[PDB]
Design an enzyme around this catalytic site. Structure first.
Site, PDB file in Angstrom:
ATOM      1  CB  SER A  80      28.629 -15.257 -11.804  1.00 29.72           C
ATOM      2  OG  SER A  80      29.912 -15.527 -11.282  1.00 29.72           O
ATOM      3  CG  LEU A 144      39.912 -12.464 -14.924  1.00 31.22           C
ATOM      4  CD1 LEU A 144      39.803 -12.896 -13.473  1.00 31.22           C
ATOM      5  CD2 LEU A 144      41.000 -13.236 -15.626  1.00 31.22           C
ATOM      6  CG  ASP A 205      33.365 -19.383 -17.016  1.00 27.01           C
ATOM      7  OD1 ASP A 205      34.276 -18.764 -16.433  1.00 27.01           O
ATOM      8  OD2 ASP A 205      32.226 -19.424 -16.525  1.00 27.01           O
ATOM      9  CG  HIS A 232      31.907 -15.886 -16.107  1.00 25.97           C
ATOM     10  ND1 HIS A 232      31.902 -16.981 -15.277  1.00 25.97           N
ATOM     11  CD2 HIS A 232      31.394 -14.858 -15.400  1.00 25.97           C
ATOM     12  CE1 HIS A 232      31.405 -16.615 -14.100  1.00 25.97           C
ATOM     13  NE2 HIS A 232      31.095 -15.339 -14.159  1.00 25.97           N
TER      14      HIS A 232
END
EC number: 3.1.1.85
Length: 255
Positions: A80, A144, A205, A232
């Site tokens: 990320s 998330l 994701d 993710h």
């Protein structure tokens, strides 16, 4: 200084860089296996986890701070926001990078014109909400990351446990990190990277949309790998598959 743990004594160095809001404890699900193949470096990014001698940084300054403590040559893996830090190192100091591996990362996290991503106004929204309630905002951005997978609840629990095991990052650190995500755009410069460049994605994701993957055209020297049932955090949902891909990569770099 930066919190930096080395595990293992393998001939190939592998540096793992975590994502926004987290710390090196996120890697504890794969670190025993990876340290059996690599000399493994687990890092708290500047301002995160135990690396508490920093405020907001530019991506360039973040990457310079990380590189200061690194081995001469290594595979650099970034998850990320970490992926942007590794990418910046590969761009500036390619002779230090045997291979670049990004996981669930985008060269330009913000949606632009004709480019999928997160609405910039959304990230700017999160930035403001840190000053109302930094805990809740960090936990929202974080939750998330695992949605939609078979293990979604247990994985979110595992992320949250990570963030909560160390003191929370200062709000300027968090805000700065979101600013990196909101504004950085490495789409053009990563065309010029020449060492092996492997991009890993989760199909599910919600932060880096799978649409971006067919970057395959923009970066024809790069290679991509999509985890079908991951979001993710593919190394959390699919740790054995994830580790195996890194073992296969080792064969393609020098010692």
């Amino acid at each position: 200084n930066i919190w930096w743990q080395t595990k293992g004594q393998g001939n190939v160095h592998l540096v793992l860089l975590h994502g926004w809001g987290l710390n090196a404890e996120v890697w504890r699900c794969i670190d025993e296996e990876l340290s059996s193949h690599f000399t493994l470096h687990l890092v708290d990014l500047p301002g995160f986890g135990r690396s508490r001698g920093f405020g907001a940084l530019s991506l360039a300054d973040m990457a310079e701070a990380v590189l200061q403590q690194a081995p001469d040559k290594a595979i650099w893996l970034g998850w990320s926001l970490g992926g942007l830090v590794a990418s910046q190192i590969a761009l500036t100091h390619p002779e230090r990078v045997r291979a670049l591996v990004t996981v669930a990362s985008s060269p330009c996290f913000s949606a632009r014109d004709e480019w999928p991503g997160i609405k910039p106004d959304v990230l700017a929204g999160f930035q403001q909400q840190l000053s109302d309630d930094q805990q809740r905002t960090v936990e929202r951005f974080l939750a998330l990351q695992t949605m939609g997978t078979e293990t979604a609840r247990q994985d979110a629990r595992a992320l949250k446990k990570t963030v909560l095991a160390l003191p929370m990052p200062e709000v300027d650190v968090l805000n700065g990190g979101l600013e990196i995500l909101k504004t950085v755009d490495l789409r053009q410069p990563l065309q010029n990277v020449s060492m092996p460049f492997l991009r890993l994605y989760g199909y599910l994701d919600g932060l880096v949309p799978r649409k971006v993957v067919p970057l395959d055209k923009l970066w024809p020297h790069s290679e991509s790998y999509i985890f079908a049932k991951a979001a993710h955090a593919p190394f959390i949902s699919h740790p054995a598959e994830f580790c195996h891909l890194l073992v296969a990569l080792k064969q393609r770099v020098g010692s």
